[PDB]
Amino acid sequence: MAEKVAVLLGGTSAEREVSLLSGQAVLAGLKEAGIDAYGVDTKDFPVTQLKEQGFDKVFIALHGRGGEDGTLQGVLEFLQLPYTGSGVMASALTMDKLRTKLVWQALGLPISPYVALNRQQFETLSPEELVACVAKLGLPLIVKPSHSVGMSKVDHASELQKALVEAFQHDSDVLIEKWLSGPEFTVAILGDEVLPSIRIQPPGVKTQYFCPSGLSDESEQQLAALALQAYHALDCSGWGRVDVMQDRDGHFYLLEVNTSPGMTSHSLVPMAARQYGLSFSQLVARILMLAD
Amino acid sequence: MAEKVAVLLGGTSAEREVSLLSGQAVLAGLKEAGIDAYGVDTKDFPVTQLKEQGFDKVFIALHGRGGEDGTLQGVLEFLQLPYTGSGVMASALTMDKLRTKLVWQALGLPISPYVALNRQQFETLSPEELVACVAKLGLPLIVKPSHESVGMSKVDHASELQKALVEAFQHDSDVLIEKWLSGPEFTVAILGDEVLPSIRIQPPTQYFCPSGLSDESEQQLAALALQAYHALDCSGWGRVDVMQDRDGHFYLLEVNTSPGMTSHSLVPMAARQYGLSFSQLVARILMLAD
Ligand code: NA
Ligand code: NA
Ligand code: NA
DSSP: OOOEEEEEEOOSSTTHHHHHHHHHHHHHHHHHTTOEEEEEETTTSOGGGTTTTTOOEEEEOOOSTTTSSSHHHHHHHHHTOOBSSOOHHHHHHTTOHHHHHHHHHHTTOOOOOEEEEEHHHHHHSOHHHHHHHTGGGOSSEEEEEOOOOSOEEEOSGGGHHHHHHHHTTSOSEEEEEEOOOOOEEEEEEETTEEOOOEEEEOOOOOOEEESSOOOOHHHHHHHHHHHHHHHHHTTOOSEEEEEEEEOTTSOEEEEEEESSOOOSTTSHHHHHHHHHTOOHHHHHHHHHHTOO | OOOEEEEEEOOSSTTHHHHHHHHHHHHHHHHHTTOEEEEEETTTSOGGGTTTTTOOEEEEOOOSTTTSSSHHHHHHHHHTOOBSSOOHHHHHHTTBHHHHHHHHHHTTOOOOOEEEEEHHHHHHSOHHHHHHHTGGGOSSEEEEESBOOTTOEEEOSGGGHHHHHHHHTTSOSEEEEEEOOOOOEEEEEEETTEEOOOEEEEOOOEEESSOOOOHHHHHHHHHHHHHHHHHTTOOSEEEEEEEEOTTOOEEEEEEESSOOOSTTSHHHHHHHHHTOOHHHHHHHHHHTOO
16 A cells, blocks of 8 residues: 655756756655655666556656656656656646747736747748848847757847857747846746745856845735746646746746756755745655645 | 568557557558558557567557557657657647647637636636626537547537536536537648648538638638647647638637548548548658658
8 A cells, every 4th residue: 555656867868967866865855754765767777667666656856858848757647657747748838938938928928029930931031031020029139949059149130140040950940039137036836835936146157046036025926826827827737847037127927837847955946945944855745745 | 671660559548449440551551552560459569668579660540548649659759769640749739629729829820719717717606607707709609628529518508508517527627618610610631741632521421522612712721720730739640620600711629640540531531632542641651750
């Protein structure tokens, strides 16, 4: 009757080294709570054998490709093992910045004005026609692939073409967004509970996090309700984090949802959890409890 | 070495019997084109061992749960085998009728008026408040769960709504109430970047290909179907289902990411009209997997 829990960690993606640390910490947190957990480095053990190996339940602490993008989640649904975080559709949809935006937009949720361009339009249209496509966005602009690399800030119209070429190296769909002044915030969600937001200050020569975020009580409440809508819009469950950006006018704009967040002692979700009053061990036991 | 190709067929879903027929036909079609293909009934053989067994490539001819919903596609991505049809995101997004509609709607593509309801609203609101939520849709109405038929009804009078909502909320926490459309229904098969000839569907069941539309209407529908398909990130192949209203406007219904491939199915019928044999069809679909 007691459950054997596999903590999937490391793997083969670019984020392997961070995932080893998330996994190690999750493992020690689950053990502290009395959970019969085992570390499973998926670089050396194939996730297709988890069931044969005796596991009843899975905690996902991989990041990036093969971890948070739906592929692993599909394996686990095929094996019929319960697992933490979001299902197939949500894990994959949250990787696609265009379709994430489209869903949010149809629900009237705030996103930064933008224009999407596919490959066929890029090949069809002259640099001057492209400039006219995006004129209503004003300046400056952010150009990026829909699926980080290949991103540029465009300060005037003449710089657009170069930024579009670079972005179309990596993808057949590209986003041109109106630039936002910042700062950036992230909001962790655990089950139905929204945790305290964190303000992020990225380096300029190191990354700094502030929790409490510094927002007014009224702003926090708006941001919390917004994050929760953004998360439910994409059909996320279990847990995740919503990244939001402020503009000069103080309004929030939705960036993305991360469906397998970092769990190292320096990561964001543990920081918000601690501020909410949970120990790391309580956090991980709660995430696991939300898998059924 | 010629590539060894696995044709996944049968499985354990409600559509097993149709998938055995699709798979049998695909198998014979691929062999006729010179492909080294083998039938693999996934009820008896686990898909997680396809690579160990020596397969280089996969043709998906399963339907329904575990075939066209992203889970199988995730196994195959993990194993790094190329496979036919759409990837994980598109396979799974096409099963979520709410999100499919939201994406289409944000792109300005035509869908029928509708209201979405979650479980918390259903528990919160009185039958009369629900009737008022959907009054703007008029009558009759189609009530259905947001994910895969099972809990789906036609509501002819306001008084029937509650019962139809109860039934739908048996199977899902999100439910769609949609305005009924006078028809007829069409389906548009897509193969790579090529749109095939539409088929008109007449429920009593009859299929017409050519569909009977004017050249100009066919062109619009073809362009519309292609946008609908690309909107949801589909690739390889699939079918787009579209419906007319009384004034002839097209409305998008759904995209099917692993269509029937029996000798009597719709995609083979459109392909035959386009000038392809069934063997050519399946060889094309396989070629689009890389
Ligand atoms: Na994700
Ligand atoms: Na699908
Ligand atoms: Na009209």
